[PDB]
Design a binder for this molecule. Structure first.
Ligand SMILES: [K+]
Ligand SMILES: [Mg+2]
Ligand SMILES: [Mg+2]
Ligand SMILES: [Mg+2]
Ligand SMILES: [Mg+2]
Ligand SMILES: [Mg+2]
Ligand SMILES: [Mg+2]
Ligand SMILES: [Mg+2]
Ligand SMILES: [Mg+2]
Ligand SMILES: [Mg+2]
Ligand SMILES: [Mg+2]
Ligand SMILES: [Mg+2]
Ligand SMILES: [Mg+2]
Ligand SMILES: [Mg+2]
Ligand SMILES: [Mg+2]
Ligand SMILES: [Mg+2]
Ligand SMILES: [Mg+2]
Ligand SMILES: [Mg+2]
Ligand SMILES: [Mg+2]
Ligand SMILES: [Mg+2]
Ligand SMILES: [Mg+2]
Ligand SMILES: [Mg+2]
Ligand SMILES: [Mg+2]
Ligand SMILES: [Mg+2]
Ligand SMILES: [Mg+2]
Ligand SMILES: [Mg+2]
Ligand SMILES: [Mg+2]
Ligand SMILES: [Mg+2]
Ligand SMILES: [Mg+2]
Ligand SMILES: [Mg+2]
Ligand SMILES: [Mg+2]
Ligand SMILES: [Mg+2]
Ligand SMILES: [Mg+2]
Ligand SMILES: [Mg+2]
Ligand SMILES: [Mg+2]
Ligand SMILES: [Mg+2]
Ligand SMILES: [Mg+2]
Ligand SMILES: [Mg+2]
Ligand SMILES: [Mg+2]
Ligand SMILES: [Mg+2]
Ligand SMILES: [Mg+2]
Ligand SMILES: [Mg+2]
Ligand SMILES: [Mg+2]
Ligand SMILES: [Mg+2]
Ligand SMILES: [Mg+2]
Ligand SMILES: [Mg+2]
Ligand SMILES: [Mg+2]
Ligand SMILES: [Mg+2]
Ligand SMILES: [Mg+2]
Ligand SMILES: [Mg+2]
Ligand SMILES: [Mg+2]
Ligand SMILES: [Mg+2]
Ligand SMILES: [Zn+2]
Lengths: 18, 125, 141, 23, 60
RNA sequence: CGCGGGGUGGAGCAGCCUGGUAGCUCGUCGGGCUCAUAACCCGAAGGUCGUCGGUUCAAAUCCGGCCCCCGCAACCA
RNA sequence: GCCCGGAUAGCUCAGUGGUAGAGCAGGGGAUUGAAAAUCCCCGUGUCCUUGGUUCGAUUCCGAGUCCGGGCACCA
RNA sequence: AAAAAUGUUCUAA
RNA sequence: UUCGGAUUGGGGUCUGCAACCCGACCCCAUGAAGCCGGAAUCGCUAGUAAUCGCGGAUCAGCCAUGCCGCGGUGAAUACG
């Protein structure tokens, strides 16, 4: 639900956090 | 069983036969022969037992060798695994020690290839 | 259920049941015992029925000693066959038990608790029995 | 051979100098 | 991580070793030519415009 | 506890008779060819032989008991 | 009345003494333009009750309940 | 005068 | 094997605030696999291929055996 790939299950958003 | 425990091959020059002793590469053979006055080019079967006992004495005492060197090498590796340092763990797991890649190489350190199954490609359809 | 792990021979001839028990006639381990008054072949099934009755009467408490062992193979022909053609097949195991044998003992339990448990135990058995407590005669042996 | 650091050949390869190839 | 790294490369660092080039045109960290202060792309862009003194597509 | 046969890589079959040896086809795994799959070609792995007991220097193989799986039989009344 | 067999996740079923798997259903990731398929990850449970053996039992032994079935004129 | 099978759904920009 | 120089022990040097993870280099010692490579498969028609070394960009250093260039030596064969 955060920045880039892979996806965290929310649309558009990924697992990487800042 | 001449020197030290090693029967160094006759029919070869001294400087080379000496290398057949665990602990003596080409450079140390250059010393012992200079430091004891034997021709580096004399075939081993052609050494006077004066030269033999001369060379044997210096070789056997200047540096440490076949079985003792092996034991000091062993104690150092043994030491690293005991303290539990990084090089120690890489000796336990039998992996490379000097920072090589292990993704794709290291067969000297790892052994023959233990091939396992791979991820399957999907079928069509 | 009890039975021998191994046997030298599979089938045994039928016994005789003469005389008082050979040994095991005195309380050996516990405080109270159950004594045979008649001879019989006691079955593995009967022995296990007496044991579980006492176990549930102690609600797992106390100790139980089985001082008989069904080592004797008990043979039986299939139903509706004629005589002959060799001996029937082993169908279970019995313990030979002559009068005066201490078959069971209990310990670590109230007298009242032992008495009841040995009474119930006795109702599983095909012989008259007796309850006993360990006297000095038992300790003299 | 070129992988042998201990020769005038291997120092020519790794572009280094030393006892085994001085200057 | 773009603009705050455009700035950071300018700042004089806590240590000499932490210095690094960036394209002064686009900000690229990689393929930065010292002579121009430019990455290999901006180089090819400004070149083809003739905005780069004396630079000319070589051939031989 | 009528008689007969069977139990061995994942599947289907050899090996047993005649004690010292595990074999064949498919299948599985790795690599080739193909744009790609299949066919095809090159390699590899996997069975202590239903089970317990005995005989033997040695048991899948010989002998007993147990489990299981097919088959056959049950006539005169 | 007596004999055999079944009971484990929401559903269909594996499992041979140290409380456990699968498939399928649903969701997410990878993959895709988006799907199908394939691969990964996630939630699933007093393993029907009761007694016993055991340090320990879904697992071995007995019973019970429910279901599912089996007995056999006679000349 | 031809060894050799096949290419999931919707979309064709 | 005076072929090969991987791996490991020890001892140094340098760059760098700093080389445990994770640098290059030096010297002692160690001295693996490898005896020309299954099915299969790539490049090149001439100063080419093959073989030899040199330089530069990046860059403190460097994991470059990579890349872009440079000249030395210099073939084989094309019937169709
Ligand atoms: K008749
Ligand atoms: Mg990833
Ligand atoms: Mg951040
Ligand atoms: Mg040596
Ligand atoms: Mg590494
Ligand atoms: Mg399908
Ligand atoms: Mg009799
Ligand atoms: Mg008398
Ligand atoms: Mg008696
Ligand atoms: Mg006595
Ligand atoms: Mg009876
Ligand atoms: Mg009888
Ligand atoms: Mg008889
Ligand atoms: Mg009988
Ligand atoms: Mg009675
Ligand atoms: Mg009394
Ligand atoms: Mg830098
Ligand atoms: Mg830069
Ligand atoms: Mg089988
Ligand atoms: Mg066959
Ligand atoms: Mg045969
Ligand atoms: Mg044979
Ligand atoms: Mg075979
Ligand atoms: Mg394959
Ligand atoms: Mg295409
Ligand atoms: Mg294919
Ligand atoms: Mg048998
Ligand atoms: Mg045997
Ligand atoms: Mg045997
Ligand atoms: Mg054999
Ligand atoms: Mg007739
Ligand atoms: Mg009835
Ligand atoms: Mg039942
Ligand atoms: Mg899905
Ligand atoms: Mg996820
Ligand atoms: Mg996408
Ligand atoms: Mg999607
Ligand atoms: Mg039960
Ligand atoms: Mg059971
Ligand atoms: Mg044809
Ligand atoms: Mg088809
Ligand atoms: Mg050598
Ligand atoms: Mg050499
Ligand atoms: Mg070292
Ligand atoms: Mg480092
Ligand atoms: Mg050779
Ligand atoms: Mg070749
Ligand atoms: Mg051409
Ligand atoms: Mg060469
Ligand atoms: Mg260069
Ligand atoms: Mg550099
Ligand atoms: Mg490295
Ligand atoms: Zn730029």
């Amino acid at each position: 639900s955060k920045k880039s790939k892979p996806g965290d299950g929310k649309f558009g958003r990924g697992v990487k956090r800042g | 069983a001449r020197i030290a425990g090693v029967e160094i091959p006759r029919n070869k020059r001294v400087d080379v036969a000496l290398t057949y002793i665990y602990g003596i590469g080409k450079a140390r053979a250059k010393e012992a022969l200079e430091k004891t006055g034997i021709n580096p080019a004399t075939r081993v079967k052609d050494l006077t037992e004066a030269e033999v006992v001369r060379l044997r004495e210096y070789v056997e005492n200047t540096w440490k060798l076949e079985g003792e060197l092996r034991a000091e090498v062993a104690a150092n590796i043994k030491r690293l695994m005991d303290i539990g340092c990084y090089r120690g763990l890489r000796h336990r797991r039998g992996l490379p020690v000097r920072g090589q890649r292990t993704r794709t190489n290291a067969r000297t350190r790892k052994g023959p290839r233990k091939t396992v199954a791979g991820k399957k490609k999907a079928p069509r359809k | 259920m009890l039975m021998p792990r191994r046997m030298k021979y599979r089938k045994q001839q039928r016994g005789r049941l003469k005389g008082a028990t050979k040994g095991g006639d005195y309380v050996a381990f516990g405080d109270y015992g159950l004594v045979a008054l008649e001879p019989a072949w006691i079955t593995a099934q009967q022995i296990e029925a007496a044991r579980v009755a006492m176990v549930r009467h102690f609600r797992r408490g106390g100790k139980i000693f089985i001082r008989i062992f069904p080592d004797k193979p008990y043979t039986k022909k299939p139903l509706e066959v004629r005589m002959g053609k060799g001996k029937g097949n082993v169908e279970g195991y019995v313990a030979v038990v002559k009068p005066g044998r201490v078959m069971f003992e209990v310990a670590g339990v109230t007298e009242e608790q032992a008495m009841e448990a040995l009474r119930i135990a006795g109702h599983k058995l095909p012989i008259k029995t007796k309850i006993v407590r360990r006297d000095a005669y038992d300790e003299a042996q | 051979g070129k992988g042998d650091r201990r020769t005038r050949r291997g120092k020519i390869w790794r572009g280094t100098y030393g006892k085994y190839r001085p200057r | 991580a773009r603009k705050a790294l455009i700035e950071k490369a300018k700042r004089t660092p806590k240590f000499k070793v932490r210095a690094y080039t960036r394209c002064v045109r686009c900000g690229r960290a990689r393929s930065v030519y010292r002579f121009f202060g430019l990455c290999r792309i901006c180089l090819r862009e400004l070149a083809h415009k003739g905005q780069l003194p004396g630079v000319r597509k070589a051939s031989w």
